[PDB]
Amino acid sequence: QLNWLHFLMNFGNIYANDPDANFDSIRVDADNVDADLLQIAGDYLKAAKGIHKNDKAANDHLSILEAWSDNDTPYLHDDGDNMINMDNKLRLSLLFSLAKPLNQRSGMNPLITNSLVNRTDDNAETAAVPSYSFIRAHDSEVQDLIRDIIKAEINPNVVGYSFTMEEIKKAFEIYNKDLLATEKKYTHYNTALSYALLLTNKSSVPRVYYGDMFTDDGQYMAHKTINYEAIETLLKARIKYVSGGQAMRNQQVGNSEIITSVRYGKGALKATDTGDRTTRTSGVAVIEGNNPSLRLKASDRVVVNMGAAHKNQAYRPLLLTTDNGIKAYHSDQEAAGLVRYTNDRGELIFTAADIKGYANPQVSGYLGVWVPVGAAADQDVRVAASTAPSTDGKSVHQNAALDSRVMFEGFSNFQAFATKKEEYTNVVIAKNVDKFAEWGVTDFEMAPQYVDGSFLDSVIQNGYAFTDRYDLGISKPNKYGTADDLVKAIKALHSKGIKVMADWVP
Ligand SMILES: [Mg+2]
């Protein structure tokens, strides 16, 4: 229903008499999506928000399709890029090359080529097709893993997803211990390696999942994951360093392989571009392996071309793999003891002294990330959207301005129920908006707000009549707080210029 969409996009106007309390954008939350409905949703955004006119209008109302497939990408593209779809091939490359157990783990080449964008050499001012990229989401796998854990370790007779509260309790004890284990029976390997690629890739809007920075269970933002520090470090570095063209390479070395991923720096689309002073102190190198047994030969070298702005230059680590986890460096001074140089050609050179396989709770393989020395404390290589008219018939354009955005899926289906007002998700969001701004979050994907411990979207969406979808914590609190708490959260995100995405189930 399009009149329910109209209500959601005017919730601030209708409930609060306050346009600053309106949602900015739409998550089209499908089973199957009819192409006709995608066209009508696009028509709403063009008529109401003028997204066809220029990138500033489009990027202030950036809307997505969630249909668990790539299938609608051609139709969305042909209909004028009025919303962006997921890059499902890249998600599957991250899952199989990095996250899977060793006996199912793919070679690393798909991380480069098995995507909407072949990132071997991505030098485009504007990518052909816009997208968002992610590794996990609220319904990507946890419900399945909790079922697997209960079936294997607690109750082998369980039918479907019909669990007792005590079964889910016990299953999360096992799940949470597995997150902290080197040898993982259930949970994903190499989360930080997946985020290092997601947050340095060109030509996609990355979406960070709440449950990769905080525990999937327990109170909102109460318990940081072991990967919180690595992911926060990458998010802050993305603002400061991540710009320009991309090169990805895949080298056989010793008994295994590595990939390299380079961004040339702001104002350098090609490896030959020299750019300006800001190009010199931006860009990044990511080095990854997915094999804990990786050992380089004494003669093995990994030569990493940083681009023509980076000849004869000091580099320092951002993230390095250690025996026990990942060390983060928060300044040039903190990394002073590990400075290395590019040569006359702008190449970093790594050896067995730098790269080997590790097995720890965060890494199954290898991660190293390097940034140029000398960035100002306030350096920000993001760019604002153009107000010049769009001239190709498309609304959303995957250019440097869209690449500057970060989406945050700001909920877990398995969050604990608040025991006091201070624990309500929407109260906590309002209190912590400075943190989302620090991370470069531009688009905040909120939980469904209408009026329950269900963790299956199927059960939730079946459990509420069409009138229930107008009750956004109004008749009684939703799981996330009162309607007034929702209004305050939307206004708080707007106070930092962060856009807020409504969950629209057609
Ligand atoms: Mg969905």
Numbering used by the authors: 233 to 262, 264 to 684, 688 to 742
What does the paper behind this entry write?
Streptococcus mutans, a known etiological agent in the pathogenesis of dental caries, expresses three genetically distinct types of glucosyltransferases (Gtfs; also known as glucansucrases): GtfB (GTF-I), GtfC (GTF-SI) and GtfD (GTF-S). GtfC synthesizes both soluble and insoluble glucans (α-1,3 and α-1,6 glycosidic linkages), while GtfB and GtfD only synthesize insoluble glucans (mostly α-1,3 linkages) and soluble glucans (mostly α-1,6 linkages), respectively. All three enzymes belong to glycoside hydrolase family 70 (GH70), which cleaves the glycosidic bond between the glucose and fructose moieties in sucrose during catalysis. While fructose is released, the enzymatically produced glucose molecules are sequentially fused into a growing glucan chain and, depending on whether a 1,3- or 1,6-linkage is formed, the resultant product is either an insoluble or a soluble glucan, respectively.
Initially, GtfB-CD, like GtfD-CD, underwent proteolysis during crystallization setups at room temperature, which we only identified after the structures had been resolved since the gels after purification appeared to be satisfactory. Our attempts to stabilize GtfB-CD with protease inhibitors proved successful.
